[PDB]
Amino acid sequence: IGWRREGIKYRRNELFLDVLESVNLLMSPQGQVLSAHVSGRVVMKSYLSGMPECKFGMNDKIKQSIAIDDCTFHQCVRLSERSISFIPPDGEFELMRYRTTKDIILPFRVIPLVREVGRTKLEVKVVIKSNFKPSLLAQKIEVRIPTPLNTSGVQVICMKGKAKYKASENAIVWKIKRMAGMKESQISAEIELLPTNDKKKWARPPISMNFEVPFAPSGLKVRYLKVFEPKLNYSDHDVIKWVRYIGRSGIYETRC
Amino acid sequence: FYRALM
Fold first, then answer.
1. Lowest CB count within 10 Å: A21, A22, A110, A159, which one?
2. What is the 3-state secondary structure (H, E, C) of A179-246?
3. May I ask the CATH class of domain A1-105+213-251?
4. CB A252 within 8 A of CB A34
5. What gap in Å lies between CA A54 and CA A95, rounded to an integer?
6. CA atoms lying within 13 Å on the CB side of residue A238
7. In this structure, which CATH number among 1.10.3720.10, 3.40.50.720, 3.40.50.1980, 2.60.40.1170 belongs to the domain A106-212+252-254?
8. Phi, psi of A237 (to 5 degrees)
9. Rounded to an integer, what distance in angstroms lies between the CA atom of residue A125 and that of residue A163?
């Protein structure tokens, strides 16, 4: 085993699992999913005695069951339900990398609305709805709404979070520290427009979001991390085990 | 946050 030494010992045998995923979405103004996928990886950080043979089980076999379009593993994994078998390297390492496209849970729905008022103003209203347990909080949310290049100024009203028109980025950036599942918030903005060449219209870029939620958008769930060390005198039940899920947006755009 | 895995 060239990725793990032979006399490792710890009085506190413990492991931490990280299911990190980036969820990507391209949605129409309608609300139809034009494209969507999750890319994720499971990082394991373990302080286990000896040369443990572990078993990683998740809700594969495709209650809760998800489909994996594809995935690669760390060399320590023994290819051939059919779960993962390995003698992990010590410390932190990437156990596997995977991709999903089906039954993804979109944590946010963005519903935009624009009204043209003459040739002088644009009235914009954007509502965001969190789609996930109420007991879970999202954080680091950011909703970026593009403004036309002939913008002379912007007025915004938002009860939750803080929004700032950024003229150099040609966008109103709305930030929200935390937001629980099954909620709804909105921002209204009035975009003040300068005169422009009447022929060339505005090709509205998509509104885009950023956020971080504590669960895997793919649906993945860790069921168990079994540790067997036949030589040393600690077993599976002696091991303290934790898991955390950090799902973050990648490209999460909504055409408006 | 981390949660216990039984």
1. A159
2. EECCEEEEEEEEEEECCCCCCCCCCCCCEEEEEEECCCCCCCCEEEEEEECCCCCCCHHHCEEEEEEE
3. mainly beta
4. no
5. 11
6. 15
7. 2.60.40.1170
8. -65, -15
9. 13
User: Which residue of chain A has the CA closest to B2?
Assistant: A244
> What determination technique applies here?
X-ray
Q: Compute CA distances A200 → A118, A169, A235, B2, whole Å.
A: 16, 21, 71, 52
- Kindly list the domain boundaries of chain A, sorted by start residue: 1-105+213-251, 106-212+252-254
Resolution to 1 decimal, in Å? Answer: 2.5
Say whether A200 counts as a known binding-site residue. Answer: no
- Cβ contact (<8 Å) for A242 and B4? yes
Contact A242 B6 (CB under 8 A): no
Cβ separation A225–B5 shorter than 8 A: yes
Q: β-strand A171-180 against A162-166: which pairing, if any?
A: antiparallel
The answer to whether A90 and A8 have CB atoms below 8 angstroms apart is yes
A162 assigned binding-site residue: yes
Q: Which residue carries 């009235």 as its tokens?
A: A123
